[PDB]
Amino acid sequence: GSSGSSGEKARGLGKYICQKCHAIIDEQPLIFKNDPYHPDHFNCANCGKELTADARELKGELYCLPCHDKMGVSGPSSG
């Protein structure tokens, strides 16, 4: 037969485990540096509010959609 062992199955579909507090992430898991995290742990840098799971990163930092949107604004844009 197959040297060793064969015959195991598992479907423990839980949720994203926060790589910070090691606690289930019911809500959308905040991905940072290729790792799950809570969007409540970190806070914006501009306003200073509770970031979100879809919080965009800026040079290592993390800003909230609200602020982030108020960043990509300008008049005459030339690619």
For Zn ion, the binding residues (CB under 5 A) are: 18, 20-21, 38, 44, 46-47, 64, 67
Q: For residues 8 and 24, which CB has a smaller minimum distance to Zn ion in the complex?
A: 24
Tell me how many helices (H) and strands (E) the chain has.
1, 2
Q: For residues 16 and 18, which CB has a smaller minimum distance to Zn ion in the complex?
A: 18
Q: For residues 7 and 18, which CB has a smaller minimum distance to Zn ion in the complex?
A: 18
Least gap, CB of 38 to Zn ion (angstroms): 3
C-alpha closest to that of 15 among 6, 4, 26: 26
Position 27, amino acid: E
What is the rounded distance in angstroms from the CA atom of residue 52 to the CA atom of residue 28?
8
